[PDB]
UniProtKB/Swiss-Prot annotation, chain A:
Post-translational modification: Ricin can induce a cleavage by the caspase CASP3. The released C-terminal peptide induces apoptosis. (Microbial infection) In case of infection by L.pneumophila, ubiquitinated by the SCF(LegU1) complex.
Role this protein plays: ATP-independent molecular chaperone preventing the aggregation of misfolded and hydrophobic patches-containing proteins. Functions as part of a cytosolic protein quality control complex, the BAG6/BAT3 complex, which maintains these client proteins in a soluble state and participates in their proper delivery to the endoplasmic reticulum or alternatively can promote their sorting to the proteasome where they undergo degradation. The BAG6/BAT3 complex is involved in the post-translational delivery of tail-anchored/type II transmembrane proteins to the endoplasmic reticulum membrane.
Record's protein name: Large proline-rich protein BAG6
Domain of life of the organism encoding this protein: Eukaryota
Subunit details: Component of the BAG6/BAT3 complex, also named BAT3 complex, at least composed of BAG6, UBL4A and GET4/TRC35. Interacts with GET4; the interaction is direct and localizes BAG6 in the cytosol. Interacts with UBL4A; the interaction is direct and required for UBL4A protein stability. Interacts with AIFM1. Interacts with HSPA2. Interacts with CTCFL. Interacts with p300/EP300. Interacts (via ubiquitin-like domain) with RNF126; required for BAG6-dependent ubiquitination of proteins mislocalized to the cytosol. (Microbial infection) Interacts with L.pneumophila Lpg2160 and LegU1 proteins.
Record text about domains: The ubiquitin-like domain mediates interaction with the E3 ubiquitin-protein ligase RNF126 which is responsible for the BAG6-dependent ubiquitination of client proteins. SGTA also binds this domain and competes with RNF126 to antagonize client protein ubiquitination and degradation. The ubiquitin-like domain also mediates the interaction with USP13.
Reported effect, residue 3 to A: Decreases interaction with GET4. Localizes in the nucleus and cytoplasm. Decreases interaction with GET4, localizes in the nucleus and increases GET4 ubiquitination
Motif (Nuclear localization site): 5-42
Residues included from the entire protein: 1008 to 1049 of 1132
Organism: Homo sapiens
Low complexity bias spans: 1-13
Cellular localisation: Cytoplasm, Cytosol; Nucleus; Secreted, Extracellular exosome
Tissue: Expressed by immature dendritic cells (at protein level).
Swiss-Prot record, chain B:
Span list, region Interacts with BAG6: 170-246
Annotated organism of origin: Homo sapiens (Human)
Lineage: Eukaryota, Metazoa, Chordata, Craniata, Vertebrata
Summary of the function given for this chain in its UniProt record: As part of a cytosolic protein quality control complex, the BAG6/BAT3 complex, maintains misfolded and hydrophobic patches-containing proteins in a soluble state and participates in their proper delivery to the endoplasmic reticulum or alternatively can promote their sorting to the proteasome where they undergo degradation. The BAG6/BAT3 complex is involved in the post-translational delivery of tail-anchored/type II transmembrane proteins to the endoplasmic reticulum membrane.
Keyword line: Acetylation, Congenital disorder of glycosylation, Cytoplasm, Disease variant, Phosphoprotein, Transport, Ubl conjugation
InterPro entries recorded: GET4, TPR-like_helical_dom_sf
A cellular component annotation (GO) from this entry: nucleolus
GO MF annotation terms: protein carrier chaperone; protein-folding chaperone binding
Protein's name according to its UniProt entry: Golgi to ER traffic protein 4 homolog
GO process annotations (BP): ERAD pathway; maintenance of unfolded protein; post-translational protein targeting to endoplasmic reticulum membrane; protein insertion into ER membrane; regulation of protein stability; tail-anchored membrane protein insertion into ER membrane; ubiquitin-dependent protein catabolic process
Entry's family note: Belongs to the GET4 family.
Effect of residue 253 to E: No effect on interaction with GET3. No effect on tail-anchored protein delivery
Subcellular location: Cytoplasm, Cytosol
Coiled coil: none
Subunit structure: Component of the BAG6/BAT3 complex, at least composed of BAG6, UBL4A and GET4/TRC35. Interacts with BAG6; the interaction is direct and localizes BAG6 to the cytosol. Interacts with GET3.
Amino acid sequence: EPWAAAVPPEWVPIIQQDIQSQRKVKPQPPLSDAYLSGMPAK
Amino acid sequence: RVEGKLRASVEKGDYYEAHQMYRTLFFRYMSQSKHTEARELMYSGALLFFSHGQQNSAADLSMLVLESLEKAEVEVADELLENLAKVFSLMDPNSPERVTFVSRALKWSSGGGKLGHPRLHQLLALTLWKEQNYCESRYHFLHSADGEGCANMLVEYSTSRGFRSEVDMFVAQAVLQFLCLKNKSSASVVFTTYTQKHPSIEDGPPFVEPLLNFIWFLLLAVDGGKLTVFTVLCEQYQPSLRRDPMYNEYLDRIGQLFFGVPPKQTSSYGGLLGNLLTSL
């Protein structure tokens, strides 16, 4: 994994785990009014 | 002196009459270059009308406070900002006048730099938070230097109004937007405060939530000036970053601002919503 050479060594297991976790299908439910209210607006 | 006589007219309920007399003396003092006396009288008059529920007159006198500040080319000072935020807090939250006042007060506070002064933004945000107008509070916190207040507000907002699937997203959204304003200090503080104080986030870093590790690592990479690290992080956390369509656009902007990488996303939800340069 080339990416592992690029980051601090102590980050590597964390990122490895997170790469695996993100493989799991977990669809985001429709985003709340509250969350979307933080979107950019003119 | 004259304040005594005007105050008596308001207390008698002659609001229209007192209002026009305040205006008369304002323009008279202004014509005589007595800008300070003009502002002081209008401010005390505004407060007096607010105490009687006379919002339209109070708001009008509040605009004349700003007229004096503008004409006299007064600079920001703590007392002036606190005065302007006090008047803001007394205005009807559902009046176009409050919108008008805020816009004009922030413009004055910029010393037309043209960014509204961050202490005024902070004061506004605090009021708006107390009023549970979280959407507007957040906007002003983002233009403030107050990451810690922002975080505490967002904990309340996320738990009160957000969904349980969004707990990590609210802090990601705030950090990324602070960084788009090149404010890495507040970005770090909002992250640290939010993750520690939020009831649904356990001890960390590292965190169980990948999006939170991404944001933690991103702050370290930006503060260290490490472009190669930044690039790896954005690549390996794409599944998390796709949860908000705008995250990759914020990261394009952040890459540009901190490292000079030309923006990569061909897509522009920004354009749809408002262009990122001019809609944060």
